């Protein structure tokens, strides 16, 4: 039968977005590009000057990321009618748990900030958390506006010589 967890959505775990992003990993296999160079490619980009593949996931990675901070503020609304900081511990403690592997996409940055947000707006309630969502969202703008800047560069180097 055709795969489709969303249909069941029993666990409702952060497994949904996990498969979506993981797509950039498999998609790379078809890119042919030297993945191992994904890091050293920056310097090698001198000749290739076509880091469109690398800049493809980085942008598509941050874009989808906005999906999390959105879910965080939601689960918080459930802490209001609950008033049980206990539930927050399970959901909150899950951050590192889900953010640990997520590193596979290089987003464990904006998240790591969540900790610092625990100093200004304590998650002692759904109100504080809802706010903490802004802290993470603020980062998305820093990387989105900074990352896209690199992509634009390739615009100036645009040439018809590209591809045979």
Protein backbone atom coordinates (compact mmCIF):
# COMPACT_ATOMS: atom_id res chain seq x y z
CA UNK A 1 0.00 0.00 0.00
CA UNK A 2 1.06 3.60 -0.52
CA UNK A 3 2.92 5.14 2.40
CA UNK A 4 1.15 7.91 4.30
CA UNK A 5 1.68 8.42 8.02
CA UNK A 6 0.04 11.86 8.13
CA UNK A 7 -3.13 9.89 7.43
CA UNK A 8 -2.80 8.02 10.73
CA UNK A 9 -1.08 10.72 12.74
CA UNK A 10 -1.27 8.63 15.90
CA UNK A 11 2.03 9.56 17.53
CA UNK A 12 1.99 13.05 16.05
CA UNK A 13 5.74 13.14 16.75
CA UNK A 14 8.25 15.41 15.03
CA UNK A 15 8.74 12.58 12.54
CA UNK A 16 6.66 14.40 9.93
CA UNK A 17 9.12 17.16 9.09
CA UNK A 18 11.97 14.73 9.61
CA UNK A 19 11.14 12.92 6.39
CA UNK A 20 10.55 16.18 4.53
CA UNK A 21 14.02 17.54 5.24
CA UNK A 22 15.68 14.15 4.86
CA UNK A 23 14.64 14.64 1.25
CA UNK A 24 17.53 17.04 0.69
CA UNK A 25 19.91 14.24 1.71
CA UNK A 26 18.55 11.71 -0.79
CA UNK A 27 18.13 14.37 -3.45
CA UNK A 28 21.86 14.99 -3.15
CA UNK A 29 22.57 11.44 -4.24
CA UNK A 30 21.13 12.36 -7.62
CA UNK A 31 22.92 15.71 -7.69
CA UNK A 32 26.06 13.79 -8.57
CA UNK A 33 27.95 16.69 -6.99
CA UNK A 34 30.68 15.69 -4.54
CA UNK A 35 28.80 15.66 -1.25
CA UNK A 36 31.97 15.11 0.76
CA UNK A 37 32.99 18.50 -0.65
CA UNK A 38 29.79 20.02 0.76
CA UNK A 39 32.23 21.59 3.22
CA UNK A 40 35.40 22.09 1.17
CA UNK A 41 33.25 23.02 -1.80
CA UNK A 42 33.22 26.57 -0.48
CA UNK A 43 36.83 27.05 -1.50
CA UNK A 44 36.57 24.83 -4.58
CA UNK A 45 33.57 26.93 -5.60
CA UNK A 46 36.24 29.01 -7.27
CA UNK A 47 36.07 26.96 -10.45
CA UNK A 48 32.60 25.50 -10.11
CA UNK A 49 31.22 28.86 -8.95
CA UNK A 50 27.90 26.99 -9.10
CA UNK A 51 27.14 26.19 -5.43
CA UNK A 52 23.46 26.22 -6.34
CA UNK A 53 23.05 22.72 -4.91
CA UNK A 54 24.41 23.65 -1.50
CA UNK A 55 22.46 26.90 -1.51
CA UNK A 56 19.39 24.88 -2.44
CA UNK A 57 19.04 22.98 0.85
CA UNK A 58 20.25 25.81 3.07
CA UNK A 59 17.38 27.98 1.82
CA UNK A 60 14.83 25.17 1.66
CA UNK A 61 16.04 24.14 5.12
CA UNK A 62 15.41 27.46 6.84
CA UNK A 63 12.12 27.96 5.01
CA UNK A 64 10.64 24.73 6.36
CA UNK A 65 12.28 25.40 9.72
CA UNK A 66 9.72 28.13 10.29
CA UNK A 67 7.40 25.16 10.63
CA UNK A 68 8.79 24.29 14.04
CA UNK A 69 8.64 27.63 15.84
CA UNK A 70 5.03 27.57 14.63
CA UNK A 71 4.31 24.26 16.33
CA UNK A 72 6.07 25.40 19.50
CA UNK A 73 3.68 28.28 20.03
CA UNK A 74 0.78 25.89 19.41
CA UNK A 75 1.73 23.22 21.95
CA UNK A 76 2.02 26.13 24.36
CA UNK A 77 -1.65 27.04 24.03
CA UNK A 78 -2.24 23.60 25.55
CA UNK A 79 -0.23 24.58 28.58
CA UNK A 80 -2.64 27.38 29.35
CA UNK A 81 -5.74 25.31 30.06
CA UNK A 82 -3.42 22.82 31.75
CA UNK A 83 -1.41 24.99 34.14
CA UNK A 84 0.76 21.89 34.62
CA UNK A 85 4.39 22.86 34.12
CA UNK A 86 4.93 19.10 34.19
CA UNK A 87 3.73 18.62 30.61
CA UNK A 88 6.03 21.42 29.49
CA UNK A 89 8.99 19.44 30.82
CA UNK A 90 8.24 16.48 28.56
CA UNK A 91 7.62 18.63 25.50
CA UNK A 92 10.42 21.05 26.30
CA UNK A 93 12.97 18.40 27.19
CA UNK A 94 12.19 16.94 23.80
CA UNK A 95 13.89 19.92 22.18
CA UNK A 96 17.41 18.59 22.57
CA UNK A 97 16.05 15.15 21.75
CA UNK A 98 14.57 16.20 18.41
CA UNK A 99 17.12 18.97 17.84
CA UNK A 100 19.99 16.54 18.35
CA UNK A 101 19.42 14.57 15.10
CA UNK A 102 18.01 17.61 13.33
CA UNK A 103 21.62 18.81 13.21
CA UNK A 104 21.61 16.73 10.03
CA UNK A 105 20.20 19.88 8.42
CA UNK A 106 22.24 22.42 10.33
CA UNK A 107 19.40 24.17 12.20
CA UNK A 108 20.45 23.31 15.74
CA UNK A 109 21.48 26.99 15.82
CA UNK A 110 18.27 29.01 16.00
CA UNK A 111 16.95 26.35 18.36
CA UNK A 112 19.95 26.53 20.71
CA UNK A 113 18.81 30.12 21.23
CA UNK A 114 15.63 28.81 22.86
CA UNK A 115 17.70 28.22 25.98
CA UNK A 116 18.71 31.87 26.19
CA UNK A 117 15.06 32.79 25.76
CA UNK A 118 14.41 30.90 29.00
CA UNK A 119 16.09 33.81 30.77
CA UNK A 120 13.90 36.60 29.44
CA UNK A 121 10.56 34.84 28.97
CA UNK A 122 10.29 31.79 31.28
CA UNK A 123 8.12 28.96 29.95
CA UNK A 124 6.38 28.89 33.33
CA UNK A 125 3.25 29.26 31.23
CA UNK A 126 1.86 29.17 27.70
CA UNK A 127 2.26 32.95 27.58
CA UNK A 128 6.02 32.94 28.01
CA UNK A 129 6.50 30.20 25.44
CA UNK A 130 4.31 31.86 22.83
CA UNK A 131 6.73 34.75 23.13
CA UNK A 132 9.81 32.55 23.00
CA UNK A 133 8.56 31.67 19.52
CA UNK A 134 9.55 35.16 18.40
CA UNK A 135 13.16 34.67 19.50
CA UNK A 136 13.60 31.67 17.21
CA UNK A 137 11.66 33.38 14.42
CA UNK A 138 13.97 36.37 14.62
CA UNK A 139 16.89 34.14 13.66
CA UNK A 140 15.14 32.80 10.59
CA UNK A 141 15.33 36.36 9.31
CA UNK A 142 19.06 36.64 10.00
CA UNK A 143 19.90 33.47 8.07
CA UNK A 144 17.19 33.99 5.46
CA UNK A 145 18.42 37.49 4.65
CA UNK A 146 22.08 36.50 4.97
CA UNK A 147 21.90 33.16 3.19
CA UNK A 148 19.85 34.43 0.27
CA UNK A 149 22.48 37.13 -0.14
CA UNK A 150 24.93 34.47 -1.32
CA UNK A 151 22.42 33.12 -3.80
CA UNK A 152 21.93 36.54 -5.34
CA UNK A 153 25.65 36.75 -5.99
CA UNK A 154 25.37 33.94 -8.54
CA UNK A 155 22.91 36.26 -10.24
CA UNK A 156 25.61 38.73 -11.25
CA UNK A 157 27.86 35.91 -12.43
CA UNK A 158 24.94 34.70 -14.54
CA UNK A 159 26.02 33.69 -18.03
CA UNK A 160 24.56 31.89 -21.04
CA UNK A 161 27.73 29.79 -21.12
CA UNK A 162 26.17 27.80 -18.29
CA UNK A 163 25.36 24.23 -19.31
CA UNK A 164 26.25 22.90 -22.76
